[model samples]
Target: DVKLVESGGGLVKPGGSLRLSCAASGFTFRNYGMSWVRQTPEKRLEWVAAISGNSLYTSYPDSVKGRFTISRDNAKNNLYLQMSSLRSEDTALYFCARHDDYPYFFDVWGAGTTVTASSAKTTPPSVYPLAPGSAAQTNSMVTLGCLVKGYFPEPVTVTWNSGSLSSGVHTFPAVLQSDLYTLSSSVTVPSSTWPSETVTCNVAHPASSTKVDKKIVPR
Candidate 1:
């Protein structure tokens, strides 16, 4: 009575229509809103929309509404996200998330389906050295930087090859962009270790890599 079940499969634009599914089970399908998120192969979640099963007031961000829709079936207890106008750009991993409005998080997530755009039916996670930040010196707190193209729920992990990491939550500062503010997540690393050592940020997500490590070398 509080779960969204989705599947993993392959599709070919070899011809016509493209349809994907996310079925709900164990929940009063009418009360909860089911959300569909499109993620890059690396497990970066992109928010597509959320649908109210009864009133049918669907909420989708401006960027994707024209191409996708959300609907539900009462008897079967399932929610659906359908997309038309298929393009190669449409190909990515799709996931079903339970919309939690109060604390604003996608609390429940379905194991994702990879929506292939080309012959390649799979994708992989990547690791790169993040932008430079102040080195952790004498046990100082050092924050590292990471950027992915989409939205993903986080409490991500940062691995230290040299220094120590604090037991703290990820932090995203509010930045005034143009007229509005945007939020992101960040964390700090501590060091009393040897100079110019390395620290890495490792993001682990279910249904994706066991670890995607981004190493950073202090200056």
Candidate 2:
């Protein structure tokens, strides 16, 4: 009546790897965010991103950019999908749904996971660095910067003014986004006090991670 099972062992042609299993008895896998949709026979079934179990996020037409991946195996409440390059134009017909953010679609679907391309299994390139309440508007003195995306040997901190915008910093760069991890500082303070000012961005990672940030005053 409803299913998504494709970990049935089948991936060993040009190079192998497959992990597909979407099981959610009646469905309630963390409110929703486990989607990986695609289609081919000509086209139409896009949107490839949204896995709420192993924390992988990306979505919104860019051709779904890059070898798709969606994971979730929460002790058997099952939910997952993984694709490794095997071309024939990257064969299609895949679906494991239940991720709706506000019309992203897919309430529950899972009945196709066929891998028959040619050779796909070379995935290692992810970086969208810059997430800690990111914002930047015009004018000459409205500074807010916090860049460090996706974890690594980390122990960072940034605390400024407390809430809106005053200042903040911690430590980074031993290998920071290749050379794009920064915390900019500037002070003049008094755009009518910018409503009490408070800016914070912090990260302490060694597996026991941390990220604290706050931004205010930007329309």
Candidate 3:
């Protein structure tokens, strides 16, 4: 599947830069070239750049001529798009896809990632507890909270994992913090499984390349 990832996109002033990545799998990487496309809020899709698998060839549109750089890491199956000297009008949804040729249409596509280029920049999220916090309480269940804060560009998603107990996990929507947001998810497990179970919290932001996962084991 095609999964496009970004490295914090918000308020990138003129002459600033933005980075994007596409982690691709389930297909032959060497047989197909990868393309990075973008769409402004009010405009259609724009071809940004493309690169060959062996890093032998690259192409870009005249609009992003000197500003866009396309690269790939064959070992990691990752395609990268780095844009410099950006402007506010550069705000858009960036996507990565597999193409039969440099100018051919993309058959497999990744989810669009939104980025805003303006005069301000936002910070990445910080997950709490460093590790998972699964402390055994005197109560009937083990209560653990995964807290995430300091994220910019508005919203972030939190997911919990604990085999068979995923359905019992509950996450609250983010709360606004001055200019950023804070989010938390709680998982409740019965005492019987506390000693043998491990719980993890995954926190991610669309504009960030950094994904935070906190894991904790019960005492």
Candidate 4:
């Protein structure tokens, strides 16, 4: 049961700090180290810092030095990333990661959580993969949903890949949670068309100068 589950997210204002935790299982946490990685809105991947499994070694990249505190509580089977003196541009997706057959690999990752900021500076919304939903499935059509979560202000744009070509789309109103907004946009397609054809969800936010796309294909 190898797994890394990350927690700790939501809005973080400038000058504020955030604490994140990664719960590890399936292996001796004390024998393997954990690293905190983050992806900027610009898609830059950064290895923030790490605390080795043996608790004898640590790694810090100059990027986050003096701002990030990395530690592990083997007794609690958790790794912690203490982010302090936060900046508005830190808005990104944070992931807790580890690797099997180490000393050479930095594989395995947690599902990750997004760090969001206020619309005062424009924060991009996080887009999730398109998924088959539990929504009622008719004999001829299938229901699928995409989650556009963790964005500031309001009104993120949603457009389907098949835009203007089809018309069974339903978008739920935005819901605010802990100062961020989330939405569920679903599309219905002919049952026979799916698995045979791929569909994509395009999300555009004021924070993101470029549009983001989430595609679904036969699995």
Candidate 5:
């Protein structure tokens, strides 16, 4: 199985540099070109660069021109990207992928890594508490959601009551808005669980030393 695994991503000061890597296996490393793409915090997809499978050619779009580098080590079966002089606007998930053809369209994807040009400060996330998934859906499993909004730095920890989850939970990525960040997470449990109202979404952000547990209780 051909695979691409990206590494070397995290919070970085604006204009700092980073060296990213994608390890390859189960395929000829230099025989197929690799491409780099990024998903902006806005969820917009952008092509960063591509190196020819033969390692004889490299291409960069105008958006990333002169700000990045792409290369590979055939013997080690790895591809790499060198990033530098980035701004906060450059915060994104960097993906390394390869197409079936020598000039593949980046169709086969890698598990991406995130690069955050830190917002320069931290803003605590406000947990919205558990709310109905919708007014209509109340099948065997009732759905409830927690909205975590207005956070910075993009990394936050979430937990349910007692940190014990009886069902599947989905936590979404933080989306940037007006220089801040927001996220949402959802959980589903039997209807009987709702009446007790013990469900709580415990959210922790670096901005605040305390966690915000949004749950139902009388003041």
Candidate 6:
């Protein structure tokens, strides 16, 4: 029942840096280790790095030596992959998994996060308005959707911001298309605060200079 989750990875230019994350659960993490591996679209899996849970030690592939950093945050139950001085060839699908003893293999794994590095930078994401065309009023509560499209690289993080309402934000896993990705986030608000509420969808990616936001008003 071990589960692993990876953070969103987006475009990065040559010489730029990127840091992706992996979270593990369902097993006793402190007793076993984890590994970060990657596979190119046309190539086989390549072992990138690993960290021991018992000893807190680290290791890396010769190809990634000196240019990458592998670290962990015990408090968050997560592992991180940091890369600097990237190049177009660095674009690939990165995976994280729990290491099994005896034979030393990754048994439990997380879905891959695609990290794209290119010389030709990509444009910011195009955000779409909330769905249902109108808000759904459930007594004193209302629900809204925020969708972002036409984003390049691999992963995108969608966040919700509404200063006027008491709301909750939920983000969905991204849908990958050829070389682009799309995702959604939702916000639920109290009808009492909808009169003047302004909701915003904040989309974040590593390659972008800043987080992109699209705002909408309730009807």
Best-fitting candidate, measured by lDDT? Answer: 5
**Compared to the true structure, candidate 3 yields what TM-score?**
0.53
Candidate 2 stretches greater than 4 Å from native: 1-16, 27-36, 39-141, 149-197, 202-219
The TM-scores, one per candidate, come to 0.48, 0.28, 0.53, 0.57, 0.70, 0.56
Candidates sorted by lDDT, descending order?
Answer: 5, 4, 6, 3, 1, 2
RMSD vs true structure, all candidates? 9.8, 13.4, 8.6, 11.4, 5.2, 8.7
**lDDT of each prediction vs. the true structure?**
0.57, 0.49, 0.73, 0.78, 0.79, 0.75
- Best candidate, TM-score-wise? 5
Instruction: State the number of backbone clashes in model 5.
Output: 1
lDDT of 6 by residue, 84-129 (tens): 9887777888998888532558877799888877754465677777
Query: What are the per-residue Cα lDDT tens digits for candidate 5 across 2-77?
Result: 6789999877788888989999888877768788899987789988988887777899997677889998888898
Worst 10 residues of 2 by lDDT: 123-132
Q: Across residues 147-204, which tens digit of lDDT does each residue of candidate 3 receive?
A: 8887877567777662444767778877767667787878778766654776778777
| Better candidate by TM-score, 1 or 5 | 5
In model 6, where do residues sit more than 4 Å from their true spots? 101-104, 123-219
Error of 2 at 106 (Å): 6.1
Question: What's model 3's lDDT at 94?
Answer: 87
Which of candidates 1 and 5 reaches a greater lDDT?
Answer: 5
lDDT of 2 by residue, 59-130 (tens): 444543455566676667776666555445545666667754325556567776654443333222222223
lDDT of 4: 0.78
